[PDB]
Amino acid sequence: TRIKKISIEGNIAAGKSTFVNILKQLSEDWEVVPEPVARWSNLTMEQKNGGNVLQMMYEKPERWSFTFQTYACLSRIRAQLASLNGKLKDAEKPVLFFERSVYSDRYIFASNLYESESMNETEWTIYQDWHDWMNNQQSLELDGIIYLQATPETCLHRIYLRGRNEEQGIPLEYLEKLHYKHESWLLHRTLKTNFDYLQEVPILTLDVNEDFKDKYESLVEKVKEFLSTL
Amino acid sequence: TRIKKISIEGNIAAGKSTFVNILKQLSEDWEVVPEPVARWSNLTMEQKNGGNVLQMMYEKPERWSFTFQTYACLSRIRAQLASLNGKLKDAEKPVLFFERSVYSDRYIFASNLYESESMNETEWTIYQDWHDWMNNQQSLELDGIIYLQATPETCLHRIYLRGRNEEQGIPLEYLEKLHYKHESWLLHRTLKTNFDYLQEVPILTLDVNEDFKDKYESLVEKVKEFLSTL
Ligand SMILES: CCCN(c1nc(-c2nccc(N)n2)cs1)c1cc(-c2ccc(CCN3CCN(C)CC3)cc2)ccc1C
Ligand SMILES: CCCN(c1nc(-c2nccc(N)n2)cs1)c1cc(-c2ccc(CCN3CCN(C)CC3)cc2)ccc1C
Ligand SMILES: O=c1ccn([C@@H]2O[C@H](COP(=O)(O)OP(=O)(O)O)[C@@H](O)[C@H]2O)c(=O)[nH]1
Ligand SMILES: O=c1ccn([C@@H]2O[C@H](COP(=O)(O)OP(=O)(O)O)[C@@H](O)[C@H]2O)c(=O)[nH]1
Ligand code: NA
Ligand code: NA
Numbered sequence: 001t002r003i004k005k006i007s008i009e010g011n012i013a014a015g016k017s018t019f020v021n022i023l024k025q026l027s028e029d030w031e032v033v034p035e036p037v038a039r040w041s042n043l044t045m046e047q048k049n050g051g052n053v054l055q056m057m058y059e060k061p062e063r064w065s066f067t068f069q070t071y072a073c074l075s076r077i078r079a080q081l082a083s084l085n086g087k088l089k090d091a092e093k094p095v096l097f098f099e100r101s102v103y104s105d106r107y108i109f110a111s112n113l114y115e116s117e118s119m120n121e122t123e124w125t126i127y128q129d130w131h132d133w134m135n136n137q138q139s140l141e142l143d144g145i146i147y148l149q150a151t152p153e154t155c156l157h158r159i160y161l162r163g164r165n166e167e168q169g170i171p172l173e174y175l176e177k178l179h180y181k182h183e184s185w186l187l188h189r190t191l192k193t194n195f196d197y198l199q200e201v202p203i204l205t206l207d208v209n210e211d212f213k214d215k216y217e218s219l220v221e222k223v224k225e226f227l228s229t230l
Numbered sequence: 231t232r233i234k235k236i237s238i239e240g241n242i243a244a245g246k247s248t249f250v251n252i253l254k255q256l257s258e259d260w261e262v263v264p265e266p267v268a269r270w271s272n273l274t275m276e277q278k279n280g281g282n283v284l285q286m287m288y289e290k291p292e293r294w295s296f297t298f299q300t301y302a303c304l305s306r307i308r309a310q311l312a313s314l315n316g317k318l319k320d321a322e323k324p325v326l327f328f329e330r331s332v333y334s335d336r337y338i339f340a341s342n343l344y345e346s347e348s349m350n351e352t353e354w355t356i357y358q359d360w361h362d363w364m365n366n367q368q369s370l371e372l373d374g375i376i377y378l379q380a381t382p383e384t385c386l387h388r389i390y391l392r393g394r395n396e397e398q399g400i401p402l403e404y405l406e407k408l409h410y411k412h413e414s415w416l417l418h419r420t421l422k423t424n425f426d427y428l429q430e431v432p433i434l435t436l437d438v439n440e441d442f443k444d445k446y447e448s449l450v451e452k453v454k455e456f457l458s459t460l
Contacts, residue, residue, distance in 0.1 A: 045359060052352040067296055071356050078363055122282040126301050129275060133308055137367070 003084060003094040004230055005140065007101040009186060010148035011178050012170070013158030015208045019148060020099050022216050023223065029091040033083045035099040036075035041164060046075055058166050065118035069110040069127060073102055073134070080140050095227060101142065106131050107193055108181050115177075132194055141197060143230045146223065147186040147205045152176045154209045202230065233314060233324040234460055235370065237331040239416060240378035241408050242400070243388030245438045249378060250329050252446050253453065259321040263313045265329040266305035271394060276305055288396050295348035299340040299357060303332055303364070310370050325457060331372065336361050337423055338411050345407075362424055371427060373460045376453065377416040377435045382406045384439045432460065 008016045020032040040050030053071055056064040080098060088094035106128070114124040150158070152175040159167045185191040186203050204226040206219050238246045250262040270280030283301055286294040310328060318324035336358070344354040380388070382405040389397045415421040416433050434456040436449050 045355060049352055049356050049359065053356070056352070063293070067353065067356065070300065070360070074360055074363065077367075081367070122279055122286070123297065125275060126279050126283070126297065129279065130300070130304055133304065134364075137307075137311070 001092065001094055003088050003091075003096050004143045004227065005084070005096055005098065006144045006146060006227075007098045007103070007142050008146050008148060009100060009104055009182065010208070011150060011152070011155045011175055011182060012167075013155045013162055014148045014150040015158065015212065016099050016148055018213060019146075019208070019216075019219070020097050022213075023097055023220070026220060027095075029088065029093045030095050030097065031083060031087045032097045033076075033080050033099060036079055037072050038099060041166075050075065054166070061113065061116070061118040065110075065113040066123040066127060069105065069113065069119075070130060072109075073105040073131065076100070076102060076105060077134065077140065084139060093227075097146075098142075101145075102131070102135055102140065103142075103185075103193065103195065103198065107185055107191060108178060112177060112181065128194075135195075142201050144226060145186060145201055145203045146226070147182065147203055148208045149182075149187070149205050150208050152179045155179070202226070231322065231324055233318050233321075233326050234373045234457065235314070235326055235328065236374045236376060236457075237328045237333070237372050238376050238378060239330060239334055239412065240438070241380060241382070241385045241405055241412060242397075243385045243392055244378045244380040245388065245442065246329050246378055248443060249376075249438070249446075249449070250327050252443075253327055253450070256450060257325075259318065259323045260325050260327065261313060261317045262327045263306075263310050263329060266309055267302050268329060271396075280305065284396070291343065291346070291348040295340075295343040296353040296357060299335065299343065299349075300360060302339075303335040303361065306330070306332060306335060307364065307370065314369060323457075327376075328372075331375075332361070332365055332370065333372075333415075333423065333425065333428065337415055337421060338408060342407060342411065358424075365425075372431050374456060375416060375431055375433045376456070377412065377433055378438045379412075379417070379435050380438050382409045385409070432456070 008020055010016050017034065017038055020034065023030055024032045036046065036050060037054070040047060040054055049071060053064060053068045057068050083096055088096065110119070110124070110127055113119050119127065152172055155175045156172050159170055181191070187205065189199065204222060206222060208219070212219055238250055240246050247264065247268055250264065253260055254262045266276065266280060267284070270277060270284055279301060283294060283298045287298050313326055318326065340349070340354070340357055343349050349357065382402055385405045386402050389400055411421070417435065419429065434452060436452060442449055
């Protein structure tokens with residue numbers, strides 16, 4: 001049929017990869033596009049570039065933020081378009097779940113890096129110009145967003161559970177800032193973007209503070225109800 | 231009709247902008263796309279970004295080369311596509327002359343900046359990946375290339391004639407390196423690219439060592455003969 005495109009949004013270690021890997025197993029009509037940055041954070045040219053860029057980012061964010069953000073967003077568009085053109089062609093009710101979106105790339109991450117002075121004004125204006133044009137040159141437009149809403153403290157604890165060495169230094173204050181941006185964008189809907197259609201996109205907010213790995217049936221029921229409304 | 235796409239290639243100050251501004255005046259069926267970098271080197275957001283990036287490049291090329299090259303190539307694709315979709319719709323024999331191409335961006339300039347250590351391997355691999363994908367995601371494929379072939383010494387003298395303050399320090403050695411790349415790509419056809427069709431694209435080589443501003447009729451005759459073969 002026509003593939004429904006749903007973005008899964010949320011803070012670092014809210015449980016997006018966990019949730020998407022749950023969903024993919026529940027229907028042959030359901031496919032997922034993992035976030036390139038998540039895959040880099042685990043042989044391919046993108047993975048080699050991504051692992052180098054991430055390591056350089058941790059060392060010197062004010063040098064590498066523009067390069068990282070442009071490659072993360074390119075990598076995501078390529079991966080989303082490949083799934084959209086590759087998969088679900090025999091499906092009766094096709095749904096593609098994106099682990100985050102080109103909108104979180106710009107309005108959460110790249111925006112935060114500009115706000116932290118890791119990009120200068122020229123880098124940030126080049127990035128927005130690049131993004132505005134790269135997304136118009138639509139096929140990836142979202143039918144819905146699922147917001148996995150967790151407290152900064154939950155996400156800090158989940159960084160600890162996941163155990164990536166590079167992340168154990170990330171402080172609660174950073175997660176608080178990303179949390180505020182997600183709340184402004186997806187709960188209050190106060191954050192202005194350059195994609196008018198986003199103000200009209202339905203949003204499902206799921207509280208994921210309680211562990212769901214062995215107990216996700218209520219969350220998935222909410223997803224199936226939300227999907228039926230689209 | 232179908233618009234013929236012709237790239238004008240050549241070293242710094244070979245006379246490309248001069249030649250393109252001559253051609254545009256000779257036919258209502260002929261239009262030109264000036265190089266964004268050339269326009270930055272003279273109020274628009276691109277011009278402000280471009281003027282900042284160029285100035286930063288002269289100060290610290292090993293910091294800004296990746297950012298510059300990505301924005302120069304994006305800016306060119308946008309400008310070429312805008313002309314291709316905007317212009318020549320009532321023309322009987324439409325021709326769009328590009329001041330350089332996405333191929334000179336990568337195989338002349340970005341390649342030289344990698345060779346000079348102004349981009350590291352990751353920057354250069356990200357750039358080529360970005361380029362390979364950004365050009366496939368064809369509408370800008372060239373029908374022909376016109377190579378304005380000038381000696382490094384001619385180009386050094388023409389930098390002097392043009393008088394841009396920032397360029398008066400550019401040394402003959404740099405122009406010699408760019409000259410060699412153009413000769414390898416467009417005369418010897420030894421330079422390998424990732425665009426198979428380029429090996430088959432017709433090339434017209436014009437010697438522009440002699441001043442042509444008041445005496446260009448033989449050059450244009452060669453252009454009209456070349457166009458009739460396409
Ligand atoms: C898991 C997070 C990875 N991540 C990013 N991830 C992204 C992204 N992810 C997915 C899609 C996308 N488009 N971007 C951007 S940055 C990331 C974050 C940092 C970083 C930035 C700031 C702080 C604050 C520390 N200071 C603040 C001053 N205080 C006085 C002391 C404490 C700490 C660490 C560094 C490197 C990377 C790589
Ligand atoms: C008119 C040229 C502008 N240009 C470029 N233009 C481009 C481009 N143009 C058009 C499309 C495109 N994609 N790229 C790339 S760099 C440019 C060139 C330089 C530059 C690089 C190297 C040297 C060598 C000097 N040293 C070498 C060591 N020796 C011991 C002493 C002498 C001197 C100057 C700096 C900034 C810019 C901006
Ligand atoms: O209900 C949950 C959700 C996540 N996690 C753990 O929290 C960490 C972060 O989850 P994930 O990678 O899914 O977070 P994302 O960054 O993808 O949002 C991982 O170690 C998960 O196994 C958990 O224990 N219970
Ligand atoms: O036959 C010519 C061609 C060019 N020029 C001058 O050479 C300089 C560089 O020309 P242009 O800007 O066209 O070079 P491009 O960088 O565009 O190849 C300018 O001052 C031109 O006016 C000239 O005097 N005679
Ligand atoms: Na599935
Ligand atoms: Na004309």
